Amino acid sequence: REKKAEYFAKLREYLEEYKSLFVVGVDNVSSQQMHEVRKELRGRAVVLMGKNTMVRRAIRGFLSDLPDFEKLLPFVKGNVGFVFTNEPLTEIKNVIVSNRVAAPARAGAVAPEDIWVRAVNTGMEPGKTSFFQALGVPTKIARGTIEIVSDVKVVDAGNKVGQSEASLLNLLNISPFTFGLTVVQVYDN
Amino acid sequence: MKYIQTEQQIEVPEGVTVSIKSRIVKVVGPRGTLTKNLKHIDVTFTKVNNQLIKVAVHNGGRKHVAALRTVKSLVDNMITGVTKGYKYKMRYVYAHFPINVNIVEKDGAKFIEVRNFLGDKKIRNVPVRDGVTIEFSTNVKDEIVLSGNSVEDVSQNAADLQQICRVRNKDIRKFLDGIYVSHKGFITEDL
Amino acid sequence: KGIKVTVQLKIQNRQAAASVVPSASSLVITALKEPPRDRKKDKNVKHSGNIQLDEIIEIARQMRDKSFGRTLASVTKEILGTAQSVGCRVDFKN
Amino acid sequence: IIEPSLKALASKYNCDKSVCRKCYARLPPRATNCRKRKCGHTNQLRPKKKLK
RNA sequence: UCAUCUAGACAGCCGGACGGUGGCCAUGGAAGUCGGAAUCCGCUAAGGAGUGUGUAACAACUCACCGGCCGAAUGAACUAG
Ligand SMILES: [Zn+2]
C-alpha cells in the first residue's frame, strides 16, 4: 500500500465527518457549466462517478464512509459518485453581484423560442459568412433600417447540431442555452 | 482446437412451455404460441428437468460453435417475446413540411399511408404483417408504437418503414426529416 | 476582481457587454483579503511569499492544488504566500 | 402532383450513412486498417438519429 | 515474442484548466503564437500554456494512472499455410 493511502487513508480519513449530499448526473449538458458552479469556491469539488472496487473495499472493510447512502441500495449499476462537498447555497444571490461577462455556452444548441434580435451597426467588414444556400436569411438594408423578406425556422428540440453555423451570427455576448435545472438530490443529514 | 463437446444452458419459467420436433420448435405461453424451423445447423437439445434445456454441439470450428450461442439467443429472445411481449416506439421529426400519416384498411390488407413528406403528392404506401398491431400514442406529440409477440416481424416492419422514409438529391446533412426508432422494450415491465 | 483570469462558464442575461472580470475560480481569496487589487498589478507579479491570512486553510489543503498534505513544514513555506497576490510591499526575490 | 414513377427513380439510390461535426469528415462502417491510401477506412461506427 | 491474472484487472458512465494561460514589436487601448524563439517546476487519486481553437486575441468548450456488483482467461506485436 503506497499510492492508495493518498486517496483513501488521506483525503477520506481526514474528512470523514461530512453529512452533505449533492447528487447530480451529467446526462447531456456542457460539462463546464455545472463544473465551474460546483467549483468557483475551487478546491472542494471533484466528480467521482466511480467504478467497481468494492470487492477490495469489503476485503479491507472498515470504512463507514457515508451511512446516509442507504436509499438507492439496489442500484449497483452505474452508481452515482462519492463526491465530498459542504458548500452553502445562499452565496450567489448576495456575495457575488454584477458578473455579466461570463462565457457563452457551446454556441449551436437549440433555443426555446423563435426570436430575431435587431442588429445595430458597428462599422466592420463582412467576414466568412458565404454559407447559406440551403435555407438562408432573406434581408434588405437601407441605412440601418433593415427589412426581412421571409422567415425561416431551422430545427426543434430533440436533434443534434450542425458543424459550421456558429461563426458570426450571435455577436451579442449571450449564452444561448444554459437556463436549466439538473440535479438528482440536494440534502443534508 | 476442435472443441469435442460444448454446450449452453437455457432456462424456461413454469408458466410457458416448449415442444421440439426433430427440427421444428414450438413455444406456447399465456400470450400465445410461436413456432420456428431450425434446418440451418442441426445441433442437439437435451432436457434436464422441466426448467433447463441444454443446447449442445460436438466437434466443430469456431464458425460451427458460434451458431450454438446464436440459436441460444434466437430461442431465449423469442420465448422472452412470447412470455413478455415486445414493443418499439418510433418518432416523427419535420423541419417545415409536417408529415401526415394514416392507417387504411382495404380487402383485409391494412396498409399505412404517408403524405406531405418533403412535398410529395402521390401515395407513399407500406404494408403490415400479422401478429403485430399499432396505436397512435395519445398524450404525446409525433410518435408511433409497434407492439407484438415475435421480434423478427416487428423489427423488420419498423426497419422497412424507416427505410422507406428516405430522400435523395438534397443536402446530405441539413435535411434530417423522417421516421426512426427510439425505444425498444416490452409490453409488460420487470416480468 | 483582478486583471488575472482563469477559465469559467456561467449564465448570462440582460444583454450585457462590459470589460470586467468574468468571475474566475479564485475570487474567494480576493473577497476575504482587502478590496484593492486592480492597481499596482501592471507587470510586477511576485512568485514569493510566506504569509498565512485566514485560519480556515485545512479545507483548501485537500484539492485546491494541495500544497503539503502530510509534511506541515516542508513545502508550505514555499507554496503559501508564493501562491498569494496580496501585497507588493517589497520586491527582492522572484 | 408528382407520381412515384418519377419520384422513386429520382430518389432510389443510397444516400444514407452517419454524419460528422468537427473537421468535415465522417468515415464508413467497414474496417481494414488506418485511414491513409495504403490502408484506408478506420473502424468507427455508430447509429444515427435520422438516416442521412 | 512480450507483458497481467483465484493479493480477481478487461468490455455495463464521468471529469480533471493553482502561478505562469493577463509572456514581446517609435510610453489614449492587444486576455493561452495573423507577419518570428520555448514547452518545467513547488505541488506529487483531482490538478494541462495543448491534435481543433467566434468580432482581423478582449466574451474560448470537449479529453488523460482515480474512484459503484458478479466471477475467469484475457491483452499487445510479429511469423507462414
Ligand atoms: Zn490510414
Q: Residue with C-alpha cell 391494412?
A: B110
6-25 on C, CB < 7 Å from strand E = 6-9, 19, 21-22, 24-25
What does the alpha-carbon distance between residue C24 and residue B173 come to, in Å, rounded to a whole number? 38
Long-range (24+ apart) CB contacts under 8 A made by D13-22 are D13/B168, D15/B166, D15/B167, D15/B168, D15/B172, D15/D52, D16/B166, D16/D51, D16/D52, D17/D48, D17/D52, D18/D45, D18/D46, D18/D48, D19/A160, D19/B173, D19/D48, D19/D52, D20/A163, D21/A160, D21/A161, D21/A162, D21/A163, D22/A163
B95 to A134: CB separation less than 8 angstroms, yes or no: no
What does the alpha-carbon distance between residue D50 and residue B176 come to, in Å, rounded to a whole number? 6
Burial class (CB in 10 A: 0-12, 13-18, 19+), C51: exposed
Q: Quick check: A129 CB within 7 A of strand E?
A: no
Query: Which set of grid coordinates corresponds to residue C69?
Result: 498534505
DSSP assignment, residue A59?
Answer: H
List chain A residues with CB under 8 Å of B182: none
Domain housing B57:
1-85
Q: Quick check: C45 CB within 7 A of strand E?
A: yes
CB pairs under 8 A between A and D: 12
Q: Based on the domain organization, do B8 and B56 belong to the same domain?
A: yes
Question: Is the Cβ of D13 closer than 8 Å to some Cβ of chain B?
Answer: yes
Listed as ranges, the nucleotides of chain E within 7 A of a protein C-beta are 8-10, 12-22, 31-32, 42-47, 52, 54-56, 58-63, 65-71
Q: If you measure CA to CA, which chain D residue comes closest to B120?
A: D2
Q: Based on the domain organization, do B100 and B41 belong to the same domain?
A: no
Distance A83 CA to E44 C1' (A): 22
DSSP lists the bridge partners of residue B8 as B55
Long-range (24+ apart) CB contacts under 8 A made by B2-5 are B2/B59, B2/B60, B2/B61, B3/B59, B3/B60, B3/B65, B4/B58, B4/B59, B5/B56, B5/B57, B5/B58, B5/B59
What does the alpha-carbon distance between residue B57 and residue A164 come to, in Å, rounded to a whole number? 56
What does the alpha-carbon distance between residue A65 and residue A14 come to, in Å, rounded to a whole number? 11
Half-sphere exposure of B10 (CA within 13 A, CB side): 24
Q: Are B11 and B52 in contact (CB under 8 A)?
A: yes
What does the alpha-carbon distance between residue A120 and residue A144 come to, in Å, rounded to a whole number? 7
Q: Based on the domain organization, do B77 and B107 belong to the same domain?
A: no
**In chain A, where do the E strands start and end?**
20-23, 139-140, 147-148, 185-188
User: Is residue B92 helix, strand or coil?
Assistant: strand
> Taking the mean position of all CA atoms in its chain, how far away is CA A10?
30
Query: Which set of grid coordinates corresponds to residue A114?
Result: 423563435
Q: How many helices (H) and strands (E) does chain B have?
A: 2, 13
User: Is residue B156 helix, strand or coil?
Assistant: helix
Q: Quick check: A49 CB within 7 A of strand E?
A: yes
Q: Quick check: C3 CB within 7 A of strand E?
A: yes
> Taking the mean position of all CA atoms in its chain, how far away is CA B129?
12
User: Is residue B154 helix, strand or coil?
Assistant: helix
Of B33, B55, B85, which closes a domain? Answer: B85
A153 to B173: CB separation less than 8 angstroms, yes or no: no
Using CB atoms, pick whichever of D24, D49, D50 lies closest to residue A163: D24
Query: b/e per residue, D20-42, with b = 16+ CB within 10 A?
Result: eeeeeeebeeeeeeeeeeeeeee
Q: Residue with C-alpha cell 399505412?
A: B112
For residues A164, A170, A171, A174, the Cα torsion angle rounded to the nearest 10 degrees is: -130
DSSP lists the bridge partners of residue A135 as none
Of B85, B112, B143, which closes a domain? Answer: B85
**Residue B39: partners with Cβ closer than 8 Å, 6 or more residues away:** B23
Chain C contact partners (≥3 CB pairs within 8 A): A
Nearest Cα residue to B112 out of B93, B140, B96, B92 = B92
CA distances from D48 to A94, A142, B106 (A): 46, 44, 35
Angle at B78 between CA B72 and CA B81, to 5 degrees: 140
* Chain B, window 125-164: residues with a beta carbon less than 8 angstroms from a chain D beta carbon: 162-163
The gap between the terminal CA atoms of chain A, to the nearest Å, is 33
Q: Based on the domain organization, do B188 and B98 belong to the same domain?
A: yes
CATH of the domain at B39: 3.90.930.12
DSSP string, B11-52: E--SS-EEEE-SSEEEEE-SS-EEEEE--SS--EEEE-SSSE
What does the alpha-carbon distance between residue B178 and residue B92 come to, in Å, rounded to a whole number? 6
Distance B179 CA to E37 C1' (A): 57
Query: b/e per residue, C66-89, with b = 16+ CB within 10 A?
Result: bbeeeeeeeebeebbbbebbeeee
Q: Based on the domain organization, do B116 and B26 belong to the same domain?
A: no
User: Is residue B7 helix, strand or coil?
Assistant: strand
**In A7-153, where do the E strands start and end?**
20-23, 139-140, 147-148
User: Is residue B162 helix, strand or coil?
Assistant: helix
DSSP assignment, residue A55?
Answer: H
Alpha helical stretches, state H, A39-184 = 54-59
CA-based nearest distance C23→chain A, Å = 6
**Residue A53: partners with Cβ closer than 8 Å, 6 or more residues away:** none
A30 to C9: CB separation less than 8 angstroms, yes or no: yes
What does the alpha-carbon distance between residue B154 and residue B128 come to, in Å, rounded to a whole number? 9
**In A20-170, where do the E strands start and end?**
20-23, 139-140, 147-148
DSSP lists the bridge partners of residue B6 as B57
CA distances from D20 to A163, C24, C46, D28, D45 (A): 8, 33, 47, 11, 11
Q: Quick check: A79 CB within 7 A of strand E?
A: yes
13-52 on D, CB < 7 Å from strand E = 22-23
- Taken in order B139, A158, D46, B169, the sign of the CA dihedral is positive
D21 to A159: CB separation less than 8 angstroms, yes or no: no
Nearest Cα residue to B182 out of B96, B90, B71, B102 = B90
Q: Based on the domain organization, do B79 and B95 belong to the same domain?
A: no
Q: Are A152 and A135 in contact (CB under 8 A)?
A: yes
Q: Residue with C-alpha cell 435535411?
A: B175
Q: Based on the domain organization, do B114 and B166 belong to the same domain?
A: yes
Nucleotide nearest to C44 (CA to C1'): E22
- Taken in order A33, A37, A40, A45, the sign of the CA dihedral is negative
Resolution in A: 4.2
Q: Quick check: A119 CB within 7 A of strand E?
A: no
Q: Based on the domain organization, do B63 and B3 belong to the same domain?
A: yes
Of B61, B85, B109, which closes a domain? Answer: B85
Q: Based on the domain organization, do B188 and B137 belong to the same domain?
A: yes
Angle at C26 between CA C4 and CA A89, to 5 degrees: 140
Looking at the 3D structure of chain B, how many domains does it have? 2
Q: Based on the domain organization, do B64 and B94 belong to the same domain?
A: no
Q: Based on the domain organization, do B25 and B103 belong to the same domain?
A: no
DSSP assignment, residue A188?
Answer: E
Q: Are B108 and B80 in contact (CB under 8 A)?
A: no
**Residue A32: partners with Cβ closer than 8 Å, 6 or more residues away:** C7, C9
Long-range (24+ apart) CB contacts under 8 A made by A184-189 are A184/A23, A184/A24, A184/A25, A184/A80, A185/A21, A185/A22, A185/A23, A186/A21, A186/A22, A186/A23, A186/A89, A187/A20, A187/A21, A187/A68, A188/A19, A188/A20, A188/A21, A189/A19, A189/A20, A189/A21, A189/A68
Distance C9 CA to E14 C1' (A): 19
Q: Based on the domain organization, do B69 and B144 belong to the same domain?
A: no
Q: Quick check: C68 CB within 7 A of strand E?
A: yes
